[model samples]
Structures are given as C-alpha cells and as structure tokens.
Target: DAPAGGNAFEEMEKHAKEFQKTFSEQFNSLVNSKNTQDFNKALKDGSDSVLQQLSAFSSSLQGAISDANGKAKEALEQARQNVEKTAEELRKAHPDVEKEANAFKDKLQAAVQTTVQESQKLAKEVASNMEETNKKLAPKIKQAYDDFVKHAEEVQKKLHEAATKQ
Candidate 1:
C-alpha cells in the first residue's frame, strides 16, 4: 500500500494553494478598485464586521501547514526507526526475505523523509508571504472618511464577515 503520510501531505498542499489563490483575488479586488471611497469603506467594514475573524481564519491555514509539516517529519522518523528495530529482529531470524525487505524499506523511507521536509519548507514560505501581505493591507481600512462612506463600511463589514465564514 502507498504511504498514508505522503498522500496526506499532497492533499494539504492542494488545499493551501487553493485557499491562497482565493485570498489573493479578494485582496486584489480591493487594491485595484476604481472607487477609493468604496475601497476604504470596504476595508473598515471588513475589519469591524469580519476582517479580524477572517484574519484568524488565515492564521488557521498557516497553522494547518505547520501541523502538516510536523506530522510528515514525525511519520517518516517513526518509519525509519521502526525499520531499524525490525532489522534487528530479522537478523535474529536470519531469513533472506526479511533482510531484503528491511533494505527496501530503509531506502524508501529515507527518500520519503527527505520529501516531507522539503514540502514542509515550501508550505511555510508560502504561508509566511500571505501573512506579511495581509498585515501590510490591513491598515488601509482604518483611515477616516466622510460620514456616508464611514456608515457604508458598517454594512460592508457585515457582508465581509458572512462571506469569510462560508
């Protein structure tokens, strides 16, 4: 059977990429808006309504990436350790097949462990960039404006919260 740990890492990477893409689109829509007033309103409204929570959600994404990385490392380490221990038992048995099997496992497990570490490193870098970008953009929303625009933000904030929750 295929290694469960490797398959899980692949799924996590796919999810993280998808989440990052959607977040980028949302951020760009605000950044490139023709209406500066609407953009500002959207920002404040987002913060008051759901921006912080959305930020929390963003953090969760990073947390998941980190969690996946650690899990991958742990899984591979355990596999290698098990193989070493198993080899000792096989030596006592002095069966040719057991020796061959352990050798195959040691080679395969070493390769897998290397891949896990690399994938974790990539995930961390991507999530870190997303966080830094979000931090830079958050302040633009809090800038003061006219009453109508300010109030419009209230409505927009509600909408922003709802969208992120979903």
Candidate 2:
C-alpha cells in the first residue's frame, strides 16, 4: 500500500526519510554490483543523490541563508568530494570484465553453430524423402492411365472388324 499523505512540512519530512534510505540502498548496490558497469552506475547515482539532497536542504530551510547553513553546506560538499574519491579508488582497483564477456561469446558461437548445422541436416533429409516418394509414385499411376487407353482401342478395333465382315 501507498504511504499516507500529510501537510507540506510532514511530507518533506517523509521524503527526507525516504531519501536517506535510498542513499544506503544505492551504495549497497554499488559495493554489491560485482561488476564494472553496474558499480560505476550505482556510484554515479549515489553521488547525484547527495547533490539532490543539498537542494532539498536549501529549499526546505524556507528562510534566508545563515551561518549554520554555510557550515552545513560545506560539510555536505566535503562528503560529496569524499564519496567521489572513494569510488575513483575502487574503480582503479577493480578488475575489468571484458575478457570474461569475450570468452562467453566465443563459447556460445560454437555451440549454436553445431546445433544449427544438425537441424538443417535433418530438414534436408525429410525434403529428399518427399521427392523420392513422389518420383516412385508417378510411374505406378501412369500404368493405370495407359491401360485405360489400351482397352478402349482394342474394343474399337473389334467393332471395326465386324463392320468390315458385314
């Protein structure tokens, strides 16, 4: 079910709580991504979320900027920089997944080639059988056709011979 609605102040508080929760979620995904592409994407999203959170801080304060706000913004900016540097370090330390992907493609290509070749061979076998059956059947049908003509001609000759005798 959906979360309940509230006044603007209460809504901002709720959004803030959810926003903080996602920060953990994003970074959790980053460490758990287990690959280069996903790690980088999660890192970027987590980084961007903090930048977005700062906007919320300013907007929600709803008053003129003060000394405390500066300190707070400064600390947040420092944290953002720290997160970037940490991710950069991790990226350098991580292993590239390119070789693994290449090996998988090579393996799949050979398997499919073998499977497809066998399938086509079976199809051709059935096609040859159909052609052979038709060729064998045609001559048997021709025998019936020839006999019909032969019997009619024989009867006609007999009737002609009778007429000549008369």
Candidate 3:
C-alpha cells in the first residue's frame, strides 16, 4: 500500500475526470445520430415528398368528389378514412415530422372544405351534362373520371404503405 499523508492533493479527480469524459463522449454520439448529412437531406426530402404526395392525393380526391359517382364517390370517402389512419400511423412513426404533419392535416381538412364547394360547382355542370349529353365530351369526361379514381386509389394505397413501413 502507498502512503498518502506525505503530500496528498487528490480530490475525487479520478471520478470527476470519468464523468467529464463520459459527458464529452455523448455529445459526439448524439450529434452523429440522426444528424448525418445524408439523412439530414432525407428529412428535408422527406418533408417535401409528403408535401407533394399529399397535394397529389388531395387533387385526386377533389376530382372524384367533384365529378364522379358511385364507386368514385365512395372511394373518396374511403380514402379520407384511410388518410386518417395512415396519418396517425405516420405521426406515431416519425414523431420528428409529426409537427408539420399535424399542420398539414389541418390544411388538408381546410382543402377538403374548399373541395366540397368546388365539387358543388362542378356538379352543377355535371348535372347539365346528364340532362344534355355532349356526344363529343362524354367519353373524355369518362376517361378523366377513370383516371381520377385510379389515382385516388393509388394514393390511398401509397399512404397506407408509407405509414406501414415505419
């Protein structure tokens, strides 16, 4: 055993150094975590992707609610419910983006309101199309309707999948 009374100046310096070293170690690890430059771009790109996909998804829903019926009409409602579920899962998964996602959902709800009004306006013309068929326009309108339902369904699937993964 070593004698310490001769010139002892030690004062838990060992434990103090251990803690400072541990604290310093954590800084770099945390900074290097989700903060990678590439994944950083992933977050940026991720936000914009949802932004784009959401808009595309909304437009398709708008069209169906505007001009289509039966399957098309019911599809929009189905998609709306799916978005709620998908969005909830998305928030649970990427809580980092959940903030913007919440705001985006709010905006989408507003857009849904505007969509209803727009659909009413379009339905007016659609009614006119019914009583008075435009031989030239009927097929074109049907084609557009086909695509809108197609796109809307695709969006419902995509959103569901996106939420499913994470």
Candidate 4:
C-alpha cells in the first residue's frame, strides 16, 4: 500500500519499513517451525525480498554515480574557464615578466646547446628528469584526488539511495 504522498522518499520509507517487518516476521516464523520444507520456502522468499531491495539500491547507486560525473564535468569546465580568465589578466599585468623570462630561457638554451654538444644528450637528460619527477609526484597526487572523489561519491550515493529507497 502506498501513502497519500508528501514526497517520494517518505513513501519509499513507508514501503521499505513494511517490507522489512514482513520479511523479518516470516523468517523468524520459519526458523521457529523447524520444518525443512517451510525453512527452504521461507529462505527463498526472504532472499528474493532482500535481492529486490538490493536491486533497487544498485540502481540508485548507478544514478548517483551518473549525477556525480555530470556535476564533476561541469565543475571542471567552470574551473578551466576561471583559470583561463585569470591567465589572461596575469599575462596582461606582467607582459615584461614574460619577455624577461623568454630572454633568460634563450640564454639558457644557448648555454645548454653549446655545453651538451649533442641533441641526443640534452633530450636524454631532460626526458629522464621529467619522467623521474612525474613518477614520484603523479601517483601521490592521483591517490589524494581519488580519495576525495570517492568520499564525495559515497556521500552522494547514500543521499540518492536514501531518497529513492521505497
């Protein structure tokens, strides 16, 4: 039986409470009966009810993941836009900083090119250094971000399941 509903969550809560009570009572009765046939029948019925609830839970979890991904995508896009705006302002404010930096870079390049003597040697050193730095830093940063994302996802999943579970 459904409620004259105020909200879907409220209605679901009512139904889920009913399902739990009924399943528990039947399971207890089956246990008390001590008859193998009754036990098996009750077990299947109880298990099916539990599975149904779980299916509902799984669907809700998927929906939550989808919602989170959408929101994350939106956030990333917005962050990119804000970064772009900030970058434009910074470049405008510090035009000569870029010119000086480029001049320093040109001098460094001239020095390195003369010192290395071989393109292959410079490539090897720079590539190796970059790879080593990335190897050390990448996993730590990824793990930190993953932990934060997982926590957010879990909270969202629980919220969605709680909203949907009737």
Top model number, lDDT: 3
- Colliding pairs, model 3: none
TM-score of 2: 0.23
Best by TM-score: 3
Itemize residue pairs with steric clashes in candidate 1.
Answer: 45-157
In the range 2-39, model 3's lDDT, one tens digit per residue, is 56221211221222223323322322222232322233
Question: Which candidate, 1 or 4, would have the higher lDDT against the true structure?
Answer: 1
Q: Which stretches in model 2 have alpha-carbon errors above 4 Å?
A: 1-8, 33-49, 52-56, 59-166
Query: Which rank order by lDDT, best down to worst?
Result: 3, 1, 2, 4
Report every candidate's CA lDDT: 0.31, 0.28, 0.34, 0.27
Evaluated at residue 103, the lDDT of candidate 2 is 25
Ranking by TM-score: 3, 1, 4, 2
Report the lDDT of model 1 for residue 31. Answer: 35
Model 3 vs. true fold: TM = 0.34
lDDT of 4 by residue, 1-166 (tens): 4553222222222233333333223323322323322223323332323223232232222222333323333332332233223212222223232334222212211221221122122223223332322232222222212322232222223323322322
* Alpha-carbon TM-score of each model against the true structure: 0.28, 0.23, 0.34, 0.26
lDDT of 1: 0.31
Prediction RMSDs, each to the true structure: 25.7, 41.3, 27.9, 30.6
The per-prediction tally of clashing pairs is 1, 0, 0, 1
* lDDT per residue as tens, model 2, 1-166: 3352111122222333333333333222223333533333333332333333232322222222122222233332332243233223222322232333222212211221222232233223323333322233222222222322232222223223322322
- For model 2, what is the C-alpha lDDT against the true structure? 0.28
